[model samples]
Target: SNIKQLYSKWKSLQPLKPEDLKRWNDKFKLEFNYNSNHLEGNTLTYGQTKLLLMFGETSGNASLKDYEEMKAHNVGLEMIKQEAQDKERPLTESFIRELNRTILVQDYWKVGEYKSRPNSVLTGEVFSYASPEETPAFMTSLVDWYNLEADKGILTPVELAALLHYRYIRIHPFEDGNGRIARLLVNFVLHRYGYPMIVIHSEDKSNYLNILHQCDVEAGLTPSDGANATLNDILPFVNYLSSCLIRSLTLAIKAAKGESIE
Candidate 1:
């Protein structure tokens, strides 16, 4: 099933060396700082998440397009934060609709769109595994599922988030912005757990999808064939997500020792 593959890939992400652990840790700290600082500024513009991801992945110059795309991404993140942190202001369909405009129609974001048929070894051409058509419904359903699961205490906070992320990707719930949304959901869970948010770098994209493919297999179906699937099998993804959190903590320790991020 896809969930199992998520687990295996997540497990494989276990930092094999202290260095690997520190690398992720530094990324996490940077992510946390970014989120906290931006949120406090009350400017929580839509581009910050992309900027965070961009800076996390590269030290080069960001194009004008990158700036625009990142702003859209931050808006999406802000909407998620609003929904998750302020239950009184639940995210609405119009908000998502506007975000879609900002991100897709406006072409204000950098992450590639969710292409159903992009050929790749990780998820194959099994495009349904990551939907560009059924994106909105999939995101709504997953968020609904997370609320229910968390309320019932059926999944730990971290585990619930991991499951949400794996399911979100499996649904590939957008023509673009699936990666950003997936990260938003991850931090949503982290907020509940009183822990910092962690960012997933674009550099890790291939490895991330490979795990998703494994998760699809573990669920006993191919990506295009799993339409009726439930996310009950996402435990592995949760474990992996938790491990990433641990990796971030480790990096903070290294920084305290004066080791450079390089």
Candidate 2:
């Protein structure tokens, strides 16, 4: 399969020295944190994000909340790496909530909880989400389905990652940080499957969301039907994420080989 070929290429550049590993990890941390947060309208520029993550230096007059959001987001990234190492630990709804909590950082009443009110994503139209009352049950089903399909080995890691991302976003479980958490969990699924992490660059946000929107349309999804969306309904999104996985792995292999990825 194409994904297998890409995965093999990525695996060929293994056993990086400590310095090279740190170099790549550090670069990804900044890029991932910056781009993910930026997609959700975080005001920090790329340089500012790099400065804060690299040197604990804050430049510009960006809001304190923006800075804190970036720091907390990086913390969540580290948590993903650590959690991915625990082969015995299954991915759970609790861990997803924890990621949401860590990303938010503030101790608000809803910090670690589902939304108290309805939320929607506005593209050409307002795409409503699962109701707050229905969120817990929807999330439980999502996790259950993932564990079942994962054990059966029915879907490739790339397919699973993208499907998980699309389903979770449809639920929009949290009041805030749903998009960021969705992206983080996408990488979480990839990392657990020994795939290279993908960064959905802010510059590519339109394409990212557009593909998702098209998938939603093709699925015949309304806010009411989103929770029950099936794999067939989301095949377009799966294809989109597969391309991203290939790109990320290709760049990772080049970087590992000391080739310019630019």
Candidate 3:
């Protein structure tokens, strides 16, 4: 009830001028980059996140890479903003690769490379990803399929994005930063379609992981097969992703109306 009604407010706020969005983006970007960075493995606490991002206290005793990643991860976040703002451009595998490279700007951050070695999820049951050999085929198909459906407008942007996220996570195209990149791709899709982007809070990662687990339960175990998961195949995640979008929408409307706190 709360989430659906926000859609009305967001629609009414259409033509969200620059000012209506900036302050919102300030909070949005900060939370997402820190949460996104943290979700993977950034070691700094939130205080340290702000400490480094706000000022320059990079002495959080975390790995030096932790601070650097938050910085670079936000850089990639800015890239998504740049890419998404341009309506003429379409999403590409090239851009996705670059996003990972930017965020994971370590030795492995070769310009447009996918993972070289095998990658996997290490839970109670070891989850395998699309092998290095399988990445190019899986990734290109993901991009092409996403582009065409996004072009055709069969599903809402969030729905298309959820499937994109699901497929990309399964592919594990990059050696690292797969989840961060996948999350960024969600915002990329949303912003390209004139929708506000949602922050998949790292704090709520349990639901995030569990919802995907539900989808994985019914979908194929073969990594490539997971890459081919249909939108209907991941209904719970689509619903979950949409709820997150609604959260963004509500927050934006509130921000636009000068109605509440960040």
How many clashes (backbone N, Cα, C below 3 Å) per candidate? 21, 0, 0
Ranking by TM-score: 2, 3, 1
Q: For candidate 2, what's the RMSD?
A: 2.0
Summarize candidate 2's per-residue lDDT along 1-262 as a digit string, tens digits.
8877878877877865666666667777888998999999998998889899999998977988899999999999999888877766878999988998899987664288888778765767677888888888889998998888778888888788888888888899888998999899889888888888988888988898888877888666665466666778888788877887877877777678776653
What's the lDDT for candidate 1?
0.53
Stretches of candidate 2 off by over 4 Å are: 1-3, 107-110, 121-124
Instruction: Assess candidate 3 and give its lDDT.
Output: 0.83
Q: Among these predicted structures, which one has the highest TM-score?
A: 2
The residue ranges of model 1 lying beyond 4 angstroms of the native Cα positions read: 1-62, 87-99, 102-125, 129-140, 220-232, 251-262
**RMSD in order of candidates:** 10.0, 2.0, 2.2
- Ten-residue region with minimum lDDT total, candidate 2: 219-228
lDDT of 1 at 204: 57
